[PDB]
Coordinates of C-alpha atoms and ligand atoms in Angstrom, one line a residue:
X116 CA -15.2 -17.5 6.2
X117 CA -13.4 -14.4 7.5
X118 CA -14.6 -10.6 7.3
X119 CA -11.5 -8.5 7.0
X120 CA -11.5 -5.5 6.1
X121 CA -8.1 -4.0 4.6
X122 CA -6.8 -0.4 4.2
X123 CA -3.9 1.3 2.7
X124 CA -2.7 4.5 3.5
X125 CA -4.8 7.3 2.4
X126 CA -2.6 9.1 -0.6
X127 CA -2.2 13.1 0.2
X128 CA -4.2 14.5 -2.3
X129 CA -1.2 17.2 -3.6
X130 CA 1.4 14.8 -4.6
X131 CA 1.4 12.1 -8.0
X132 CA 1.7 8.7 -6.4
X133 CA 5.3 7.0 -6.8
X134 CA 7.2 3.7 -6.3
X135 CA 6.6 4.6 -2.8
X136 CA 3.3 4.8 -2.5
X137 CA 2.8 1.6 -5.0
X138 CA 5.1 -0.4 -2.6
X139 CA 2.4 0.1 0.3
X140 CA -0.4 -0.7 -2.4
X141 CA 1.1 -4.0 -3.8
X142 CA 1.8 -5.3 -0.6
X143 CA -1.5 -4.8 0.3
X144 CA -3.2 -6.2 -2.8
X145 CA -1.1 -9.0 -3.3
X146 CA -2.1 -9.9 0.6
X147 CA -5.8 -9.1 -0.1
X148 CA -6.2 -11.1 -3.7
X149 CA -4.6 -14.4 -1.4
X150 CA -7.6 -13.9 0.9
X151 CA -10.1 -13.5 -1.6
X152 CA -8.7 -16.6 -3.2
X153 CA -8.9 -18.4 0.4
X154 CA -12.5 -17.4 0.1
X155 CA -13.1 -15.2 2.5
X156 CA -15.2 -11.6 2.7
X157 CA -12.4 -9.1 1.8
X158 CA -13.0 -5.3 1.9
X159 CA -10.0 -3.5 0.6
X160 CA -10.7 0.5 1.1
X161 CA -8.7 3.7 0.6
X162 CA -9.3 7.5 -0.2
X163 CA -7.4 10.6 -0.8
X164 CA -6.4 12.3 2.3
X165 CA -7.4 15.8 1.2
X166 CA -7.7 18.8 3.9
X167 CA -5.4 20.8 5.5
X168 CA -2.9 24.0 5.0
X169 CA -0.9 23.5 2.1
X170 CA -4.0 22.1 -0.3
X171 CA -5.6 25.3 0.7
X172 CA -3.0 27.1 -0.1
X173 CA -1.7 25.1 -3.3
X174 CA -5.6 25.7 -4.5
X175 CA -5.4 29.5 -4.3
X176 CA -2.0 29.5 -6.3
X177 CA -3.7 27.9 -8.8
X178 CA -7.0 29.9 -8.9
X179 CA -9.2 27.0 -8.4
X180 CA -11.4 25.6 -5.5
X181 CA -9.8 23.5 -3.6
X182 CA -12.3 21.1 -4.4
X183 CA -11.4 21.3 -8.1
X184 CA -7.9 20.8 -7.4
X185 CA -8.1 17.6 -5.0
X186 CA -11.1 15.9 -7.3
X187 CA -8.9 16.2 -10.0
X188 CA -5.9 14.5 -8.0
X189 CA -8.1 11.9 -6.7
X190 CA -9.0 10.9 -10.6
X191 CA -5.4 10.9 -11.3
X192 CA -4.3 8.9 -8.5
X193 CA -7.4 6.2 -9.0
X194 CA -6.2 6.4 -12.7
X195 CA -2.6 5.3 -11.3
X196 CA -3.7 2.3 -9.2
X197 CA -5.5 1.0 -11.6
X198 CA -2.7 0.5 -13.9
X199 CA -0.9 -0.9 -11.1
X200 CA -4.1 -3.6 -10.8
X201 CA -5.0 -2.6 -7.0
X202 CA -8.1 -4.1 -6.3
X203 CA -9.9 -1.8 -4.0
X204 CA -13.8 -2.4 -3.3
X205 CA -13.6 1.8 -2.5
X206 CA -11.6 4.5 -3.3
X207 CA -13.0 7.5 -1.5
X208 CA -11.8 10.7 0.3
X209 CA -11.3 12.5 3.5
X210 CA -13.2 15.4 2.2
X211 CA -16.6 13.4 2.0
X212 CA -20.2 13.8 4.0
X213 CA -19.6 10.5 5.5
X214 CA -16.3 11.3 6.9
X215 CA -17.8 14.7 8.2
X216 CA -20.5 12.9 9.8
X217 CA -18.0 10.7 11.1
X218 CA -15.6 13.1 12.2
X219 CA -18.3 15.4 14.2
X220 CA -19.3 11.6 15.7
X221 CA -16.1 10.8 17.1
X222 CA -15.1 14.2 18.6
X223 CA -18.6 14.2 20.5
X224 CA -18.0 11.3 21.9
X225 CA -14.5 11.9 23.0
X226 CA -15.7 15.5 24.6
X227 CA -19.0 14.1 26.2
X228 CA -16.1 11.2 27.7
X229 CA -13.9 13.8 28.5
X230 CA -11.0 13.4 26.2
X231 CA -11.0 17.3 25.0
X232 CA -9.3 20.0 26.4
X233 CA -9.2 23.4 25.5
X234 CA -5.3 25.4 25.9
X235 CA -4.5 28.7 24.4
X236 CA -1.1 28.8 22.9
X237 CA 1.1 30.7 21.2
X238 CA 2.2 30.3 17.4
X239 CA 3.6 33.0 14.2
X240 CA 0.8 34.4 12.1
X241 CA 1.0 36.4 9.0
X242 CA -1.2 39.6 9.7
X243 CA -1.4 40.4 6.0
X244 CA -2.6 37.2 4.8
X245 CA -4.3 37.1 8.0
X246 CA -3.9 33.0 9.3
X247 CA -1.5 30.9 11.6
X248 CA 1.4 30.0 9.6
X249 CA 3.0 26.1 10.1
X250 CA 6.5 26.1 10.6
X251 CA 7.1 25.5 7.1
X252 CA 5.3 28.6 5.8
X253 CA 7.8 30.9 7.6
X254 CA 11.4 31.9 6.0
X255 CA 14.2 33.8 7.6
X256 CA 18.1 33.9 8.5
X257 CA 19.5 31.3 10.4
X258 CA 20.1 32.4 14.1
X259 CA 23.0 30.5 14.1
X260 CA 25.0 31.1 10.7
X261 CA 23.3 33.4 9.5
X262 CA 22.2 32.1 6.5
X263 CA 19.6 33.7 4.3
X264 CA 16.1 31.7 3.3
X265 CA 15.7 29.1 5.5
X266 CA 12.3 27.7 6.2
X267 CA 11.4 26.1 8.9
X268 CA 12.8 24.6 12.2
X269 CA 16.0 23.9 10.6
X270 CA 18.9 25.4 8.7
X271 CA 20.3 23.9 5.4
X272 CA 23.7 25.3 5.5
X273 CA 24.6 24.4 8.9
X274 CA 22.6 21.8 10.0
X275 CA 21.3 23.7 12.9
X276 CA 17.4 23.3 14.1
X277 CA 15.9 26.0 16.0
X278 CA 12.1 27.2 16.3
X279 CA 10.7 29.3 13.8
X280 CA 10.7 31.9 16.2
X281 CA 14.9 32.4 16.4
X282 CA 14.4 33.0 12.7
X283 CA 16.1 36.7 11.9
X284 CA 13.7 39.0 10.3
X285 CA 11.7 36.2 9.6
X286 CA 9.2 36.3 6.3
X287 CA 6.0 34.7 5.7
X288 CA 6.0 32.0 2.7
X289 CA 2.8 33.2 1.6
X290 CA 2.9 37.2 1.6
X291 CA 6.0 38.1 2.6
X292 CA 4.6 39.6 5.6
X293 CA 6.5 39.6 9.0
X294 CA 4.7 37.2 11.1
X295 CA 4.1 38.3 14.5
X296 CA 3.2 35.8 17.8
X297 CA -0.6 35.7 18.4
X298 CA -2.8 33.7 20.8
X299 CA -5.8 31.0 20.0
X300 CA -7.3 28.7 21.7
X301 CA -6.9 24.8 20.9
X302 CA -8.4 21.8 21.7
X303 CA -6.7 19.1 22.6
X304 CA -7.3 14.9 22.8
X305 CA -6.0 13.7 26.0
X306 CA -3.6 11.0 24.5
X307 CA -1.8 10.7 28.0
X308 CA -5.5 9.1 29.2
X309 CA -4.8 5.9 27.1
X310 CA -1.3 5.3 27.7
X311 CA -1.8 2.1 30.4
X312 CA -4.7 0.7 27.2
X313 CA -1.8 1.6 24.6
X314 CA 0.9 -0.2 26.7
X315 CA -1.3 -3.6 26.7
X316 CA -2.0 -3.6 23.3
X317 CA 2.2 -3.0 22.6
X318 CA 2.6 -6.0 24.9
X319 CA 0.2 -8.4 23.5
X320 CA 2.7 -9.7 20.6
X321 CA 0.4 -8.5 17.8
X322 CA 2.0 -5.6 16.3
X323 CA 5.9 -6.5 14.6
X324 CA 8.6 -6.4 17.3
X325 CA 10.2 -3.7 15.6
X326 CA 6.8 -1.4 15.7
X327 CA 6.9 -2.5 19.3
X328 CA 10.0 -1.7 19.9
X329 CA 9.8 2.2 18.7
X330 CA 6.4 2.3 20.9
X331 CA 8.3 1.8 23.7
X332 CA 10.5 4.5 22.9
X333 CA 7.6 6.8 22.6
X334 CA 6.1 5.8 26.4
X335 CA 9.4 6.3 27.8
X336 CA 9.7 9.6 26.1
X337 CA 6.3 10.4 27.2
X338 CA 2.8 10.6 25.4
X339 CA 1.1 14.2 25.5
X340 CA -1.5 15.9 24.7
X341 CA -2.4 16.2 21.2
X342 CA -3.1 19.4 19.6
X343 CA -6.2 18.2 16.9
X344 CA -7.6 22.4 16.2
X345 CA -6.2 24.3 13.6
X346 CA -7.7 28.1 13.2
X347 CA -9.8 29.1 10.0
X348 CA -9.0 29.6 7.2
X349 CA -8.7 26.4 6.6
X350 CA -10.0 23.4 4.3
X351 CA -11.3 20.9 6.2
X352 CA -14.4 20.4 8.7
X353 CA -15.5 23.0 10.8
X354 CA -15.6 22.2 14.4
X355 CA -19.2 22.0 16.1
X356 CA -19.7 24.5 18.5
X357 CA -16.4 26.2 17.8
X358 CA -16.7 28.9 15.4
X359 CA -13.3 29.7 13.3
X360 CA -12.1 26.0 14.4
X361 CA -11.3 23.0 12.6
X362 CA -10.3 19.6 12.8
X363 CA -6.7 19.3 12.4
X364 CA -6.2 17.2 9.2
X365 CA -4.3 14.0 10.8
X366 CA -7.9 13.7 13.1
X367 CA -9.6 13.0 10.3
X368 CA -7.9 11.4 8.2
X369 CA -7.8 8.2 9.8
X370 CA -12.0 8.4 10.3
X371 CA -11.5 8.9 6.1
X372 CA -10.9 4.0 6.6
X373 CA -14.0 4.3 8.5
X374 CA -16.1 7.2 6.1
X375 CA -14.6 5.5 3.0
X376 CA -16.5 1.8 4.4
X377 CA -19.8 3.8 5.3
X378 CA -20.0 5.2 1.5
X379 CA -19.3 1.9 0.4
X380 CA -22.0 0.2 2.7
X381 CA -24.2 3.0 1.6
X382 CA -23.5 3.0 -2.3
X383 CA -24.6 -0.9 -1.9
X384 CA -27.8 -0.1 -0.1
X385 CA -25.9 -2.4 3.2
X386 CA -27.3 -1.2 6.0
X387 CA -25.7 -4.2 8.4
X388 CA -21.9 -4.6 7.7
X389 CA -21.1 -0.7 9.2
X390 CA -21.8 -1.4 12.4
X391 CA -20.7 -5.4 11.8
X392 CA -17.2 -3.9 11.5
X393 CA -16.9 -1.2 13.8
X394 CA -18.8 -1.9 16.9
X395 CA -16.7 -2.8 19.8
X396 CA -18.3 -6.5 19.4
X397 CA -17.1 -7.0 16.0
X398 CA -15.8 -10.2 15.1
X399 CA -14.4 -9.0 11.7
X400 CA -10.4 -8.3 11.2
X401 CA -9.3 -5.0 10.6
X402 CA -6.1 -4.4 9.2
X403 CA -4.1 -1.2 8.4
X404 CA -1.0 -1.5 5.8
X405 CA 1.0 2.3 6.6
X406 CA 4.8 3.3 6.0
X407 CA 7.0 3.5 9.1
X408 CA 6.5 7.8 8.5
X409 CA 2.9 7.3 10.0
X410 CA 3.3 4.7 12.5
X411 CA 2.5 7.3 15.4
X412 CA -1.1 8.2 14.4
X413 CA -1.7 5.0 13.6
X414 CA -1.0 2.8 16.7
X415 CA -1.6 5.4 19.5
X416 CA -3.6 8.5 18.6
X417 CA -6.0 6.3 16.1
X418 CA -7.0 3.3 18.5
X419 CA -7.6 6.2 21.4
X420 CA -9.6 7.9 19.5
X421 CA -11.6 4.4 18.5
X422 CA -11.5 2.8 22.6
X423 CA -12.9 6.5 23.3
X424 CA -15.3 6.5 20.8
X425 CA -16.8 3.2 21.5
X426 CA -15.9 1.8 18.5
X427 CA -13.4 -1.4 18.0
X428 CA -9.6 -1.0 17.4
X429 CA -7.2 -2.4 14.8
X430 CA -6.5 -6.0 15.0
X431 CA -3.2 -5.3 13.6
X432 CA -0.9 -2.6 11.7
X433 CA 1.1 -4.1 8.9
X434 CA 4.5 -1.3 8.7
X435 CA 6.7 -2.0 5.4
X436 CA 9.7 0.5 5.2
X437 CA 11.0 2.8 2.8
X438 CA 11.8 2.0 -1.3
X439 CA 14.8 2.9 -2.6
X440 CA 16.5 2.7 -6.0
X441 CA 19.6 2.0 -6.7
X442 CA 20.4 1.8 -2.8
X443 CA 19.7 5.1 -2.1
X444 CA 16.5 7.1 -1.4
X445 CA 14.8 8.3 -4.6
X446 CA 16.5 11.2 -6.0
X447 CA 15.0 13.5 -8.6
X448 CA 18.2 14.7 -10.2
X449 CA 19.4 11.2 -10.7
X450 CA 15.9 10.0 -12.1
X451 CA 15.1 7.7 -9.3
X452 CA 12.3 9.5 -8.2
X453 CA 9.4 7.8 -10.2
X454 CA 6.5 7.8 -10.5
X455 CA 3.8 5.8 -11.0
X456 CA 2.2 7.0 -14.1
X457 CA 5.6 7.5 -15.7
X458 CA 6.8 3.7 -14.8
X459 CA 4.0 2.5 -16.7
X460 CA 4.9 4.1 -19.7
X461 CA 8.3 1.8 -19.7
X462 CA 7.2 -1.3 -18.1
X463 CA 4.2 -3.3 -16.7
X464 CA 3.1 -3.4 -13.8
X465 CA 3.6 -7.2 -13.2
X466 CA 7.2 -6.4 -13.5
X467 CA 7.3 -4.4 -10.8
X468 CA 4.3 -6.4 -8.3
X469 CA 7.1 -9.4 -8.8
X470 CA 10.4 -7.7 -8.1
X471 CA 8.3 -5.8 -4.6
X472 CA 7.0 -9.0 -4.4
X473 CA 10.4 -11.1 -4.2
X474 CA 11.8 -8.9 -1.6
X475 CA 8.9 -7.9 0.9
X476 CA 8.6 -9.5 4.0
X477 CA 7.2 -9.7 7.7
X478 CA 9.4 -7.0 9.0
X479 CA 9.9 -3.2 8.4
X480 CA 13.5 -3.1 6.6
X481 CA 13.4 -1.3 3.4
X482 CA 12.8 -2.2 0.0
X483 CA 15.3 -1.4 -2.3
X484 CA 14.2 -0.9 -6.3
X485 CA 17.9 -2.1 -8.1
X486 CA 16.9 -1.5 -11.4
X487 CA 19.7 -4.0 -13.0
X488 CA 19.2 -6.3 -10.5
X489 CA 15.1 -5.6 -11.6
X490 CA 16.4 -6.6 -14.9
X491 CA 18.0 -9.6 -14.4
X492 CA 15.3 -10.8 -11.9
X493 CA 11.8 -10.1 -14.3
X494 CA 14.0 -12.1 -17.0
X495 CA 15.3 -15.0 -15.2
X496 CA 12.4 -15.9 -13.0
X497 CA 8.6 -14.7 -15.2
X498 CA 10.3 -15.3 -18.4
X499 CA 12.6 -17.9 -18.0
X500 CA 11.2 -19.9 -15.1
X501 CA 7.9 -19.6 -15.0
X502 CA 6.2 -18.9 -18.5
X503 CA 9.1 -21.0 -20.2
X504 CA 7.1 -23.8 -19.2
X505 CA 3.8 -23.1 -20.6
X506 CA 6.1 -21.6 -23.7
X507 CA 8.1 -24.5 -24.4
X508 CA 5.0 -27.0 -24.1
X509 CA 2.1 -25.2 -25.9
X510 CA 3.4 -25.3 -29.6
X511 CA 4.5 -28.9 -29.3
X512 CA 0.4 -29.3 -28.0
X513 CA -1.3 -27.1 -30.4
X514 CA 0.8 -28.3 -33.4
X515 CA 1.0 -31.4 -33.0
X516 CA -2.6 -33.1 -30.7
X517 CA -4.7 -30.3 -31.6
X518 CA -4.7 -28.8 -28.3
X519 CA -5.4 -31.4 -26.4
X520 CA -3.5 -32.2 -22.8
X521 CA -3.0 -35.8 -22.1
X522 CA -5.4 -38.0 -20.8
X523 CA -2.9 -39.0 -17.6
X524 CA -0.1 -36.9 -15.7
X525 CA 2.9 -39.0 -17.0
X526 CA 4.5 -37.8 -13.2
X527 CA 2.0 -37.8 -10.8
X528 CA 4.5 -37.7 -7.9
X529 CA 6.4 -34.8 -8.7
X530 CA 3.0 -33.3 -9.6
X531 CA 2.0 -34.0 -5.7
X532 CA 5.4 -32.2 -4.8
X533 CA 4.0 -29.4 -6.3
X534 CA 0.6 -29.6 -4.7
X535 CA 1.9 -30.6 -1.5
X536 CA 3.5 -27.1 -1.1
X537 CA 0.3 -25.1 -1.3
X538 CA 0.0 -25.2 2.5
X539 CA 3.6 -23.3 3.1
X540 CA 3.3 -21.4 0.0
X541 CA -0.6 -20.0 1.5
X542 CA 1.1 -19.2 4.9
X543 CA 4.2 -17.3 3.6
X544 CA 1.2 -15.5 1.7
X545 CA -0.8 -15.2 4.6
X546 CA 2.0 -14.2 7.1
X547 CA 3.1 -11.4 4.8
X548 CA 6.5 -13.5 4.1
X549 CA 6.8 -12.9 0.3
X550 CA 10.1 -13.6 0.0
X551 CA 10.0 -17.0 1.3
X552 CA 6.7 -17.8 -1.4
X553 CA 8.4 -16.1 -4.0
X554 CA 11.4 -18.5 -2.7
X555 CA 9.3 -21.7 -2.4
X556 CA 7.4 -20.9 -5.9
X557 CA 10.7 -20.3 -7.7
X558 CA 12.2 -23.6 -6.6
X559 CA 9.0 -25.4 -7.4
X560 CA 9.8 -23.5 -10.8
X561 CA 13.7 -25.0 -11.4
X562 CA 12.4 -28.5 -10.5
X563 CA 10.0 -28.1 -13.4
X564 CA 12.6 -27.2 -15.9
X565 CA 14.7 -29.6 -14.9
X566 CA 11.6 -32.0 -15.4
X567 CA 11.6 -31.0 -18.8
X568 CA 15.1 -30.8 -19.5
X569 CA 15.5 -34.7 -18.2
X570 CA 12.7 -35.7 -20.9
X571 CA 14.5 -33.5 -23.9
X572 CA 11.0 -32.7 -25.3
X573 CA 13.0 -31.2 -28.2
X574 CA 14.8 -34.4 -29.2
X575 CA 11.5 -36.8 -28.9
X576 CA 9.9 -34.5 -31.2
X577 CA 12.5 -35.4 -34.1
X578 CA 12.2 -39.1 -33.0
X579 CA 9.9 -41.2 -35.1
X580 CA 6.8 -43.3 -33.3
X581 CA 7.3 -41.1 -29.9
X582 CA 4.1 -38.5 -30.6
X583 CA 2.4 -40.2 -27.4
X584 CA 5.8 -39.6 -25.4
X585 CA 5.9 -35.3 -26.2
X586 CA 2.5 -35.4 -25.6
X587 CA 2.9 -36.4 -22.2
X588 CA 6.3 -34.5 -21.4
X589 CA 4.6 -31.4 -22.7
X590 CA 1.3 -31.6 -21.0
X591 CA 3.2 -32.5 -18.1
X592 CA 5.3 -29.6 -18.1
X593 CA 1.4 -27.1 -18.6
X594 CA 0.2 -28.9 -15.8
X595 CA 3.1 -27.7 -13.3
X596 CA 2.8 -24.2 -14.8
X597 CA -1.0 -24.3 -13.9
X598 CA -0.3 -25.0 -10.4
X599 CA 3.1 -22.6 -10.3
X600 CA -0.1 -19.8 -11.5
X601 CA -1.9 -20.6 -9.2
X602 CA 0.6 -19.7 -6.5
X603 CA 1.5 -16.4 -8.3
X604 CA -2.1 -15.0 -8.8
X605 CA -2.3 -12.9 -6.4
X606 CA 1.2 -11.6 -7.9
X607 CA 0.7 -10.7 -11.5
X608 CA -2.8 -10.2 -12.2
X609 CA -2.3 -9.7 -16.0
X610 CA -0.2 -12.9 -16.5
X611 CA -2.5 -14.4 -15.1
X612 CA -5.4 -13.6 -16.7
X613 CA -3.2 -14.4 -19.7
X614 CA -2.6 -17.9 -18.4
X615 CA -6.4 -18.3 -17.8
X616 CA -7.1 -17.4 -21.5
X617 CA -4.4 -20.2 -22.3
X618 CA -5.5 -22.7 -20.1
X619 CA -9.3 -22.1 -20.5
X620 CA -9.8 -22.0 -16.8
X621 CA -10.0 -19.6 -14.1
X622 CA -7.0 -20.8 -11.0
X623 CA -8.6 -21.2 -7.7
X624 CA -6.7 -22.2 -5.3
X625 CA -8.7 -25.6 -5.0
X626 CA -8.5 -26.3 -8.0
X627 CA -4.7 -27.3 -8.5
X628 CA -5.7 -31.2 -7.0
X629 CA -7.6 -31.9 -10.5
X630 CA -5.3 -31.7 -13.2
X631 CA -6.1 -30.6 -16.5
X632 CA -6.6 -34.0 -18.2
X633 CA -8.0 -34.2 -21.6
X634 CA -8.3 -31.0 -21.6
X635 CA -8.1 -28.3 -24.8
X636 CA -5.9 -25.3 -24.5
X637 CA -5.3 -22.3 -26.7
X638 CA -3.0 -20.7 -28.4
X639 CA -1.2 -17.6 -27.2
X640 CA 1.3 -14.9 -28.2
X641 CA 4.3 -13.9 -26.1
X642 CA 2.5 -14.2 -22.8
X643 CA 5.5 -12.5 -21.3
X644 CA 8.6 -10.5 -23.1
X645 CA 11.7 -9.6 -21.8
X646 CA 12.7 -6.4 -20.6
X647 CA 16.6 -4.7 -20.8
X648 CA 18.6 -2.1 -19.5
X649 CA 17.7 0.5 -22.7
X650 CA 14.7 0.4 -20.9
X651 CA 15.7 1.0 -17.4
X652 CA 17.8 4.1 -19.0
X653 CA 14.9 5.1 -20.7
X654 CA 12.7 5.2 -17.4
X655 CA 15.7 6.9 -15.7
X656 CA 15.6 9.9 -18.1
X657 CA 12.1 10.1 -18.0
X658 CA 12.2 10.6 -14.4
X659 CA 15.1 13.0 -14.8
Ligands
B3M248 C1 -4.9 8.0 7.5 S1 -3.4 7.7 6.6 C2 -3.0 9.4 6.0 C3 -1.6 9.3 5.4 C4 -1.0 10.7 5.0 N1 -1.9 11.3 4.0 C5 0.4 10.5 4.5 C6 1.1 11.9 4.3 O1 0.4 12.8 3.8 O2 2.3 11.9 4.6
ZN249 ZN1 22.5 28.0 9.7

């Protein structure tokens, strides 16, 4: 049995999680329910990803601590997954003791190895408000066009980019202040120290060839130091030592996998598995699931930081692109930016697990959300494939043998075709190619209505002396829709507990080579309805 532990991005704590955000998490929980089913140790761990400039400032807009504000985001966020069924074994936060702790850890160990380097630079500040500003915390004319109320580095009349310093008469966002150049000192980690380290690990074969691929682009382009102090105020962790200082937010953040583990270790009085997982000598897998937006941090600051630290690195990074609806990136005044709380009010969220589910894969392309096409696909495959065989067998059953399955498969080889697959199903599953099991499980699916269609259970039921004959076609048909479950757990949680309450038994994986033979089912209601385009217009609108 394997130790793996799994993480998904850690959710910024001032934003409502969307179809985005629940791409990243489905993929991830569909991979980690397959290897809990495979039966191995599984720890699945995220957080809110809570410090830095803007939730400092968002907090004082609203008169509230900022740890008002990002608790209650972290309660509405958890609220969220759960809807969505995303099995974490933690939910924690950046802004925690543990990551503290951890934080302080890892910086004292990088500046004792000599990985910090103090540089004074340069940057706007807003002598009213009295802090640094970010980039996107000053406003002013466009140097180029002239433009009035541009924010930024970038101009959105003309298209031109520029540093926030060309700006004319520039303004602060948050007085309205002119900000004026002032020194500080920074420290920096010495990124450029790991590059030959970072260049092995890109050629090892590990990470997708596409990830690889933009690596290379970023050795060529050349790493650099990497600036990880922001001045106070701030909300975050104070820098040991450093008065005024903090850690940047993005060098935390990643410690939050590692802080979010301890606090789970701790809250189960476990005082083996931290180290188990995170010393160098580890044998467990670690595995991060993150958007292509976050790839840097991820696969060259992060596993410095770790070699430097003396702790182990990644075993891999799992990169899934962007969702779009409709073709196009979500777009608020079309009411294809959703989220995740409002999608639940319109559909379940086995709907959606399926139809992300159906077109993920191994690589890094995007993931486009058609909502006809999302229509059309929930429809045809759950209700019509899939759940039309337990719903065209179970009456016959319940009506007419009093529940009972028959005492013999009346096909056993086609039910071995569908046991057979279980190995290529598990390492499309395992291999993060969910299109091809989706694939594989769907055709498994049209070979078991055509099964059914070949017997005509609805013309031997009219047909006198042939009760023996419709009780074998129809357990027959149960019996593939067991197995097809199976295959899909990790999929559609709900459906399948559903399925379970039908079939009184829990699916292992195992389990699909004994049949249920003489076996009593139940009776259900609509284990699965369709959906329609009112709906989809409905969600739309919402959204708008
Ligand atoms: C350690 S992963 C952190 C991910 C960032 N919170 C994503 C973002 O804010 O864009
Ligand atoms: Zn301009």
């Amino acid at each position: 049995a394997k130790k793996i532990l799994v993480t998904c991005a850690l959710p910024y704590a001032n934003g409502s999680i969307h179809l985005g955000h629940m791409l990243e998490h489905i993929q991830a929980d569909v991979w980690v329910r397959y290897q809990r089913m495979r039966g191995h140790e599984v720890n699945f761990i995220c957080a809110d990803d809570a410090h830095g400039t803007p939730i400092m400032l968002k907090a004082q807009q609203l008169g509230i601590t900022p740890e008002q504000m990002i608790g209650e985001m972290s309660q509405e966020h958890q609220t969220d997954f759960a809807g969505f069924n995303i099995s974490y074994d933690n939910y924690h936060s950046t802004h925690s003791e543990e990551n503290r702790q951890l934080s302080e850890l890892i910086y004292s160990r990088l500046k004792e190895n000599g990985f910090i380097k103090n540089r004074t630079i340069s940057q706007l500040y807003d002598p009213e408000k009295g802090m640094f500003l970010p980039d996107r915390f000053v406003k002013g004319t466009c140097p180029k066009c002239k433009s009035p109320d541009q924010y930024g580095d970038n101009c959105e009349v003309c298209g031109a980019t520029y540093s926030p310093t060309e700006l004319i008469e520039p303004k602060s966002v948050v007085s309205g202040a002119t900000p004026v150049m002032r020194d500080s000192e920074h420290f920096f980690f010495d990124l450029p120290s790991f590059s030959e380290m970072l260049q092995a690990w890109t050629r090892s074969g590990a990470l997708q060839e596409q990830v690889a691929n933009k690596m290379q682009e970023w050795f060529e382009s050349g790493l650099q130091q990497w600036d990880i102090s922001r001045d106070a105020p701030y909300f975050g962790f104070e820098i040991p030592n450093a008065p005024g200082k903090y850690f940047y937010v993005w060098l935390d953040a990643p410690i939050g996998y590692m802080g979010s583990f301890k606090n789970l270790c701790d809250k189960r009085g476990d005082s083996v598995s931290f180290d188990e997982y995170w010393k160098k000598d580890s044998t467990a897998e670690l595995y991060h699931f993150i958007g292509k937006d976050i790839i840097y941090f991820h696969s060259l600051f992060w596993p410095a930081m770790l070699e430097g630290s003396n702790f182990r690195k990644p075993s891999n990074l799992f990169v899934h692109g962007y969702v779009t609806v409709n073709g196009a990136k979500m777009s608020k005044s079309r009411g294809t930016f959703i989220k995740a709380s409002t999608w639940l009010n319109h559909f379940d969220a086995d709907s959606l697990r399926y139809y992300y589910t159906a077109k993920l894969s191994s690589r890094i392309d995007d993931i486009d959300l058609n909502l006809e096409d999302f229509v059309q696909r929930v429809n045809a495959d759950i209700v019509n494939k899939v759940v039309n065989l337990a719903s065209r067998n179970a009456g016959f059953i319940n009506k007419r043998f009093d529940g009972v399955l028959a005492s013999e498969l009346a096909d056993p080889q086609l039910y071995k075709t569908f046991t057979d697959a279980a190995e290529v199903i598990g390492e499309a599953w395992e291999s993060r190619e969910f299109g091809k099991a989706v694939r594989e499980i769907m055709a498994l699916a049209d070979l078991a209505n055509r099964y059914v269609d070949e017997q005509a259970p609805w013309v031997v039921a009219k047909q006198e002396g042939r009760d023996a004959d419709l009780q074998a076609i129809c357990s027959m048909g149960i019996n593939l829709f067991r197995v097809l479950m199976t295959y899909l757990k990790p999929v559609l949680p709900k459906l399948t507990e559903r399925a379970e309450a039908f079939l009184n038994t829990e699916l292992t994986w195992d389990g699909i080579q004994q049949p249920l033979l003489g076996h009593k089912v139940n009776p259900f209601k609509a284990l699965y309805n369709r959906i329609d385009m009112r709906q989809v217009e409905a969600l739309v609108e919402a959204s708008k």
